Structure formats: C-alpha cells, structure tokens
Amino acid sequence: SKRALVILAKGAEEMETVIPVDVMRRAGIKVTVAGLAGKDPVQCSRDVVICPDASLEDAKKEGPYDVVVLPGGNLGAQNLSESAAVKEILKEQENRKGLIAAICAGPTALLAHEIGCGSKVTTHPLAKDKMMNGGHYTYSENRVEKDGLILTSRGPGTSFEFALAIVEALNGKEVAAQVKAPLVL
C-alpha cells in the first residue's frame, strides 16, 4: 500500500494541500500530513487551520514514502525552501528514486534545494521567474507537467489534475479513473 508524505508549513495554500490529501486518500494511499514546524495546528494562506497528523520531525522517521508532495502558497513555499529537514528529505527522495510533487509556488522549493535540475517543470504563472532564476529548469505551461520523478502543477484549479496525476503515477490509470468519476469534474 502506497504512502504519501505531505509537508505543511504555515502560509501553505489550503486548497492545494487538502485536495491532494483528500484525493490520494480516496485512492487508498496512506497520507501523512506533517507540520513543518511541529504537531501544532497550521494556519494557511487563507486562514483555514489544519491539524497535522504529525510533525515532520516524527514523520521523517517513518521510513520512505512513495511520494513526497509540496503544497503551494508563496509564504508556505518560502518556509519549505528555508527548511533543512525538507532539504534532506527531498534529497533522499531523489537519491532513493522516489516521486516528488509540487504545485503552484511549491516547486520553487526544489530549486532552493537543488532538486531535479534539468527537468521540465511548471509553476504558477507568477512563480515562473523565481523558479527559472539561473535557468536550471525548462519551463512548461501545461496544467500538469511530469518529467520522470518530478511532477509539477500550476495552481489551485489544477490541484485535482495534480492529485490525480500522482494517483495514476502511484496506482495506475484504472484507480485514478475510478477515484475521478465520483468527483464530478
């Protein structure tokens, strides 16, 4: 049974964190919502407050994940980009050859941690310049971009496609389709 690690830092975009967690869980994949700052509730960009399942501190110890997903939100992505814990996890996930997914401003975290340089990726239009600084990536405008183990999406309204892509990547076309239907997309 596939496992997903979702890192939630304050400033994180609510819709971008909940949609993938919800979706992935609908797909029978064990999702762990780890609060970047601990086990305390996290205040997201639009003030909705989420209680983490656990702190990154603990979650990190729970062996590897088939997918580690980075939510968007300017500030949230900044918090991640400045976190040493996230740096070690992303790097482990890239050596271990696992999947890394980031939506909206979230991929600018792969940049800060030098993850997957050379991959084709996408971001929120307004996060393109930051993500492209230094030309270490090749930009794309598709709603969902997947270059090997690097899966990126653009924003809130691409979350469903983002999340379903992860599902397909982890459990295949059949499961993603079954999960998708009831969603009324």
Active site residue 124: yes
Measured CA to CA in angstroms, residue 47 lies from 99, 141, 182, 184 at distances of 29, 29, 28, 27
Identify the experimental approach: X-ray
Instruction: State how far the Cα of 70 lies from the Cα of 86, in Å rounded to an integer.
Output: 10
> Token match 């939510």: residue?
71
**Cα 177 from chain centre:** 21
Is 104 in the active site?
yes
With contact defined as beta carbons under 8 Å apart, do 159 and 20 qualify?
A: yes
Which residue do the tokens 């997309």 mark? 185
Collapsing DSSP to helix, strand or coil, 119 comes out as coil
Vertex 121 angle, CA 115 and 125, to 5°: 115
Q: CA 123 to CA 111: how far, in whole Å?
A: 12
Q: Is 70 helix (H, G, I), strand (E, B) or coil?
A: strand
Amino acid at 153: S
Domain of residue 65, residue span? 1-185
The closest of 15, 66, 26 to 169, measured between CA atoms, is 66
Q: Are 40 and 56 in contact (CB under 8 A)?
A: no
Q: How far apart are CA 25 and CA 6, in angstroms?
A: 12
| Rounded distance between C-alpha atoms, residue 107 and residue 77, angstroms | 8
Nearest Cα neighbor of 31 from 58, 1, 75, 11 is 1
Check if the beta carbon of residue 169 is closer than 8 Å to that of residue 152: no
Which of 44, 113, 124, 136 is an active site residue?
124
Local structure of residue 137 (DSSP, 8 states): S
- Do 145 and 7 form a contact (C-beta atoms < 8 A)? no
Out of 104, 113, 117, 136, the active site residue is: 104
Is residue 73 classed as helix, strand or coil in its secondary structure?
A: coil
The domain that holds 22 is classified in CATH as 3.40.50.880
φ/ψ of residue 33, rounded to 5: -90, 100
Count of other CB atoms within 10 angstroms of residue 51: 11
Number of domains in the chain: 1
The data reach a resolution, in angstroms, of 2.5
